[PDB]
Paper text:
Bdellovibrio bacteriovorus are small predatory bacteria which invade the periplasm of other Gram-negative bacteria, round up these (typically formerly rod-shaped) prey bacteria into spherical, osmotically stable structures called bdelloplasts, kill the prey and replicate within them. Essential to bdelloplast “sculpting” is modification, by the Bdellovibrio, of the prey cell wall peptidoglycan in the prey bacterium's periplasm. In this study we have discovered a novel use of some evolutionarily diversified class C PBPs, by the predatory bacterium Bdellovibrio bacteriovorus HD100 when they invade prey and construct the osmotically stable bdelloplast from the prey cell. Compared to the active enzyme, Bd3459 (S70A) bound significantly less Bocillin-FL as would be predicted. Together these data establish that Bd3459 is a PBP with DD-carboxy- and DD-endopeptidase activity, as suggested by the bioinformatic analysis of the protein sequence.
We solved the crystal structure of Bd3459 to 1.45 Å and this revealed predation-associated domain differences to conventional PBP4 housekeeping enzymes (loss of the regulatory domain III, alteration of domain II and a more exposed active site). Domain III has also been postulated to regulate substrate access and limit the ability of PBP4 proteins to bind bulky substrates. It is of interest (and relevance to the wide diversity of bacterial prey walls that Bdellovibrio attack) that Bd3459 possesses no compensatory regions in this part of the fold, leading to a much more accessible active site. The domain II:III:TP contacts of housekeeping PBP4 enzymes are replaced in Bd3459 by a region of novel structure, composed of AA 144–210. When building and refining the Bd3459 structure, it was apparent that a covalent modification of S70 had occurred during purification/crystallization. The tetrahedral arrangement of the reacted sulphonyl group is reminiscent of a transpeptidase acylenzyme transition state, with atom O1 occupying the classical “oxyanion hole” formed by the backbone amide groups of S70 and S360. When comparing the Bd3459 and PBP4 structures, this sequence insertion takes effect between N292 and N303 and forms a “thumb-like” hairpin on the periphery of the active site pocket.
Numbering used by the authors: 37 to 438
């Protein structure tokens, strides 16, 4: 690979002028890769708030034969796949539901079994043209995965993690489901003897922490669509930053290639816009009592993240999001130094076709530049942070009768 710097820039968090320091390319657009996910994080924090929960509702009606019909009124929870399903099945059994006759769901019930795994973390997030096409696929996933025997290995890994955050799950959960179909919200009205039960996701801050630890494309793309997509994003950023297409041009929430191999399309912005995003996201989280480390990964301390391997002066001092696509490798976040907290962004150009004997070049240049920033500012100052365990649910997610 051959590499060169597109731009690097930075700003003290307490600057009274909010002038951004950096090279002469700091106001030129460059591909962002997954540092796009911090922009989606800021939009989601501003629109929904860090303590927002996706409230998926189950409408449960007893049946004549002693079982239940259940209709899922979806919430567009963007992290509802295998692990939330396992928790839901545990919770159904805790609520004495073991057999379902008719399971139906609406167009806001988004289910992607592998949402937190390969290949959805790094894949092209499915984009459906109609709700019927989406639901065809959700029905198939409910039939093949939700309704069939639970994997003992994945389930016991989840249950042990859930216990660490104070959530109870049963040892041998099991559900039987007779029939599964799509019912649009406009075609659903509850039965007279139905009980509504609410399954809340973990708070948005936790969903964002998991996304920004893993670099999860599925979660990022579905948050961006849920908030209105590109037309809504462009208006949000024009109203928030007085920015326009010359500052920032997005097409999806993840930063992944949104086009074809021969016509690729990547989110782009200027380095200065990345600093203004971080300043605004830090300000919105502080108003709710949170820090960037509540939604972004901490070097070394978040071992289940793309910066768990980072060491040196960044370990424990630096909160940051990585990105990589064919032509760009990027990093942005904050460094905590003896002279205070400093926002930064580093945007590198990569060419993988050349000098194939050379690898890890852009990553190591970025680490060296960020380390230098910390050291010019008196060295690292450890932040206050305990490694989080961000699962799709928490101890307030239990099914609860409304």
């Amino acid at each position: 690979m051959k590499v060169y710097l597109n731009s690097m820039c930075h700003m003290a968090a307490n600057s009274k002028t909010q002038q951004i320091q950096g090279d002469d390319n700091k106001d030129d657009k460059f591909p962002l890769a997954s540092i796009s996910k911090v922009v989606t994080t800021l939009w989601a924090v501003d629109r929904l708030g860090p303590d927002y929960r996706f409230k998926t509702k189950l409408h449960v009606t007893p049946t004549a034969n002693g079982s239940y019909d259940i209709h899922i009124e979806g919430s567009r929870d963007p992290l509802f796949g295998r692990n939330m399903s396992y928790f839901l099945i545990s919770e159904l059994n805790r609520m004495k539901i073991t057999k379902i006759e008719k399971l139906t769901f609406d167009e806001n019930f988004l289910l992607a079994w592998l949402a937190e795994e390969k290949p959805m973390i790094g894949g092209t997030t499915p984009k459906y043209d109609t709700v019927e096409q989406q639901a065809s696929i959700v029905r198939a996933t409910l039939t093949s995965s939700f309704a069939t025997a639970i994997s003992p290995g994945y389930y016991t890994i989840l249950k042990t993690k859930a216990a660490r955050i104070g959530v109870q799950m049963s040892n041998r959960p099991k559900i039987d489901v007779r029939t599964i179909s799509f019912v649009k919200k406009a075609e659903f009205q509850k039965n007279e003897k139905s009980t509504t039960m609410v399954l809340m996701s973990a708070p948005l801050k936790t969903i964002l922490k998991r996304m920004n630890n893993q670099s999860n494309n599925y979660i990022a793309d579905n948050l961006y669509w849920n908030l209105g997509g590109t037309e809504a994003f462009n208006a949000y950023i024009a109203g928030k930053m007085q920015a326009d297409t010359s500052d920032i041009e997005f097409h999806n929430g993840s930063g992944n290639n949104e086009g074809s191999v021969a016509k690729p399309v990547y989110n782009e912005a200027t380095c200065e816009m990345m600093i203004k995003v971080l300043y605004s996201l830090d300000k919105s989280l502080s108003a709710k009592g949170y820090d960037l480390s509540d939604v972004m990964a901490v070097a070394a301390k978040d071992k289940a993240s793309t910066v768990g391997s980072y060491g040196g002066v960044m370990a424990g001092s630096t909160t940051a999001k990585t990105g990589s696509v064919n032509k760009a490798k990027t990093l942005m976040g904050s460094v905590s130094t003896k002279n205070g907290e400093i926002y930064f962004a580093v945007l590198m150009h990569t060419d993988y076709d050349k000098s194939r004997s050379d690898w890890g070049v852009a990553s190591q240049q970025i680490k060296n530049k960020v380390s230098q920033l910390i050291n010019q500012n008196g060295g690292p100052k450890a932040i206050k942070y305990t490694e989080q365990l961000p699962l799709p649910f928490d101890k307030y997610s239990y099914l609860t009768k409304a």
